[PDB]
Amino acid sequence: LPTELRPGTNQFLTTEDDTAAPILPGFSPTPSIHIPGEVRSLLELCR
Amino acid sequence: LPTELRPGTNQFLTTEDDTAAPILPGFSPTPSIHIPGEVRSLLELCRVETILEVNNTTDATGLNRLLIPVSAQNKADELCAAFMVDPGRIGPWQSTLVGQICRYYTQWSGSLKVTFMFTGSFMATGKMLIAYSPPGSAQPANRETAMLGTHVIWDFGLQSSVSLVIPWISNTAGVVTLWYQTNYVVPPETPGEAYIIAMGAAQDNFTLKICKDTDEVTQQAVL
Amino acid sequence: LPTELRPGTNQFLTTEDDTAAPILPGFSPTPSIHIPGEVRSLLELCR
Amino acid sequence: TLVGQICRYYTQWSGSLKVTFMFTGSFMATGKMLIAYSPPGSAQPANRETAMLGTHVIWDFGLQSSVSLVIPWISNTAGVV
Amino acid sequence: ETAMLGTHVIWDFGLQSSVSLVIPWISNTAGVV
Amino acid sequence: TRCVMNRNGVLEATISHFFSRSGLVGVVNLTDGGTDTTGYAVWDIDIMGFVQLRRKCEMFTYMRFNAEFTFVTTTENGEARPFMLQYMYVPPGAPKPTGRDAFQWQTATNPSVFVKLTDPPAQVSVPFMSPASAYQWFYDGYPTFTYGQCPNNMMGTFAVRVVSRVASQLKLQTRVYMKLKHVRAWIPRPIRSQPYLLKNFPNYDSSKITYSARDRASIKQAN
Amino acid sequence: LQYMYVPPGAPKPTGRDAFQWQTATNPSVFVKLTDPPAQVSVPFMSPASAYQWFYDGYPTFTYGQC
Amino acid sequence: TRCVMNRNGVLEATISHFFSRSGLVGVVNLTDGGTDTTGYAVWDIDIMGFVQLRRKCEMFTYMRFNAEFTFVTTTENGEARPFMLQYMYVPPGAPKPTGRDAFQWQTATNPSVFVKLTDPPAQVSVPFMSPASAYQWFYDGYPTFTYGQCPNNMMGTFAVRVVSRVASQLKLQTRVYMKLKHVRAWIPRPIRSQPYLLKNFPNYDSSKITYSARDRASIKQAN
Amino acid sequence: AQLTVGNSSITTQEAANIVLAYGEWPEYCPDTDATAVDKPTRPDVSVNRFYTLDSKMWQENSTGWYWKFPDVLNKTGVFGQNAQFHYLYRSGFCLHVQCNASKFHQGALLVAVIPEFVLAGRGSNTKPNEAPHPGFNTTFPGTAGASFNDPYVLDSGVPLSQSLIYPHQWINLRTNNCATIIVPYINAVPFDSAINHSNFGLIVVPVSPLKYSSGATTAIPITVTIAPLNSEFGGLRQ
């Protein structure tokens, strides 16, 4: 598959949203539980 | 097709899972056969009963390190032996596959099974108290304060191979103690000095997490 | 389209099977004919 | 032999072989040869007798000229004929 | 050893006392036990 | 006391994940000069070199997998300069390179890969190359139609050089890192506790016999 | 270069050429310096369901260390 | 005795896989200077150059395939420096370049490819260029309307230079590697046993006639 | 009870408390190219008989004993005759180990099968030309079977305490004086040499030393009986 590059390669935007290699593959984190006092947006605090 | 790159190119993660060019294309390996004794996870090993090096001392040199002595020359209502329940610790578990495999991992959790085996005469008879004291406590002083917790009795004069289920453990730890509920009853003409074997393994509910290498192997390499 | 590279780039495996740019595009080779005495595998010779 | 030549072009081979023999004398002549195969892991036979006690054939080339033989197995000392 | 390679039985008389055995044939040197 | 109560998942416990996380097994040095060196280097493919996974490999007997090798390089100094190398794999039963410019390097059946040194490290995928259905880390019995050398564990070897007729005055130290794909084990073995003495043979010192569990004061005192 | 991550409860490298760098369970990533910077993704590594920025109470079976 | 019993697969035995595994056939040297050299180099496309696949190619008579050439380069020293080269292919029946800056390099019908030397080696795909349905490695009979020269086996040639009007004081050794795609053979031939004497003609020494099988003591002693 | 096979007959207790090594029964070799080209012989008539080796004398200071299969049978009857005259071999085994002791003896023995059991070259001297390998007599003891020297390490550099992942069984002089294992063919290649490669090896070790009173028997007799299963031979060499 032939391709080309364009400007924007090899740069590191502090704002951009991209993945990265998960260095602990197959890993299993500790599952979550229904912790009361959750939030989803700071607007909840501002009121 | 125009594209762009992003950070993460040309790097070599020792952990990442990726393919590579198969340098022998079209190759045909030797096909597999139904080899008995297969495995699929080390947990299968961790639920197998191995022996504990419970007699850990400087005075026992060989197999004697694995045998709990018992005699009628000891009195009743006294402590015979005891140990901790801590596989990945410096104690009489490092001889056990559970402890060995815990050394290969950071955090474990679950329930365990500790069994004991007696080997004396058929005619002999006694009664041992097998008392477990959960962590956050001290090992019992006497038999009485131990009887007030998760304990079993064991009249090895009748039933030899005894077992026990420790409910929980994770990562001080719980203790297991063996007391003379009675004296070693003995008929005439028998030495009246026997040995108890202590075996241990993990139950199904056990689980392991992040892997780490071990320390007991002090050698970097050999060649 | 943002992407990343991985180890194995710019290398030349003497074994790998890949295409290359056909430098004579649209070219028309001489067509084949039913030449007797064909083969498809050296095992035919070994018997 | 092309089998040997082509084996030189590869590491591991396996299977069964066919060895044949052809006689060329007179039509009127006649004899009898023993063609004895001794599988590997053994020594070539000392005499005809210890060879007759294994995979063998006879061959009265006075009647039947072009004789054949099938060696069962080989892979990669070896068998003897 | 050379006896174990023929018609033989074992007998752990610690458990089973009265043991038997069947000799197959005889007529009229003879067999040994 | 952060006594966890939550069952963790079982995916790290699989042999697959127990032989993942590519690590190193071999480091070689390659200096190029005149008639006072070799200008090339040869390394036989080995597993039991570094004793951390030799312990994890003897934990079973029979194994079968595919290899994923990665060759990284640098100067002993550390700098990365634009030179073109040549790695070549050699399958078993094939002559190894004896000299820099010898003919084996120009061999076709021998596979090879050409890279720049300013190129990211190279990757390759070796398949299961044994004649047998599996590798045997233990072959009690002579291979003769000096003892215990497995007739089939040689994956082959590797050879490294630079591609030039000039003696490029260069000193490199090449590190390899090996990943295992699609492992399948069989017949678990108990883990070795004694330090090694030499490769490929499981000898041991019958005098400085180490004990698996360290020593405490008595048996009636846990801690 | 060589960056290596070390999970908790594991010995840290004491020297340049010490043995911990040659460790497998310790993950690591090798890059060129003329290579764009490296990226990695750490997952939630706590034993607990969450991190606690405040743990009033001694961790003993010197104060407040989570 | 590792006497294997398992039938292995037949995919390596195919002519396809017997002419795969791209290898080299040609190495050229290119030095650039003033009026004491050429500054360029020409190499006619050849097959029977290196005698390992000449044996594999005479194993049949008539063949048809597509070529996959890869041009790798370096300095005789070994270093890779940022210079722009020019490879050009020349089809048969076309004039070859006589000088560095001669006009043939500026030719359109002649295809060419421009790369950096710090660029990974170049690849190209030549199709079947014979007038005939296949190549003939043997053409007993004069081509006249000095003997046996096949009228159609010339794939063409190649020419290499750097792109500059300055005499860049540079000494390169270029290696080519050739892969064969979609081979189709015909009429197998027996393998030649005698060493060669000169190219393109299957002569042989009628005095030092080598024997295919070496010599033993008798016929009644195998070994 | 009693078990009679071929011409041999050995009595024991009634028991289905018997271990299957890795949970599979023995079985003949399925279709391979060897199974396709020729029929390797399937003797099932007389080679299958409960062979009874020489008794062993367990004492107060005994280390333990072991054997090597099929090397223990390489010179024993018709089976040995088939073993040294066929370079292809395959089989399973029924190992019935008995001890004959009174109720006044104490001591505990461990029965275990080990595949690819490799003995260790003791006498540490790191040297290529020295290489103190164990000799032919030791690594291939043959019929009698040798003893141990360092049981806590199994004379193999491997701790005994973890040796229970192996198919094992306890012999306690109180509860039972007998035990039995069944082991199938354990090798990474269907056939092999019966004479220069042992597939596995039995071990018996006193994990609780024998003890007794004044006037008792000082040596416990331990016997082992063995019966092959579904064996197969190939390639009659002379």
Numbering used by the authors:
A (entry chain C), C (entry chain C): 2 to 48
B (entry chain C): 2 to 172, 188 to 239
D (entry chain C): 97 to 172, 188 to 192
E (entry chain C): 145 to 172, 188 to 192
F (entry chain A), H (entry chain A): 66 to 210, 220 to 297
G (entry chain A): 150 to 210, 220 to 224
I (entry chain B): 14 to 251
What does the paper say about this structure?
The expanded intermediate is termed the A-particle prior to genome release and B-particle subsequent to genome release. This recapitulates the externalization of VP1 visualized in Poliovirus and CV-A1625,26 rendering the inter-pentamer interface less stable and compromising capsid integrity. The A-particles showed no evidence of bound KRM1.
The icosahedral capsid contains 60 copies of a protomeric unit composed of four proteins, VP1-4. The binding of such receptors can trigger pocket factor release and viral expansion, leading to externalization of the N-terminus of VP1 followed by VP4 to form a pore in the endo/lysosome membrane through which the genome is thought to be subsequently released.
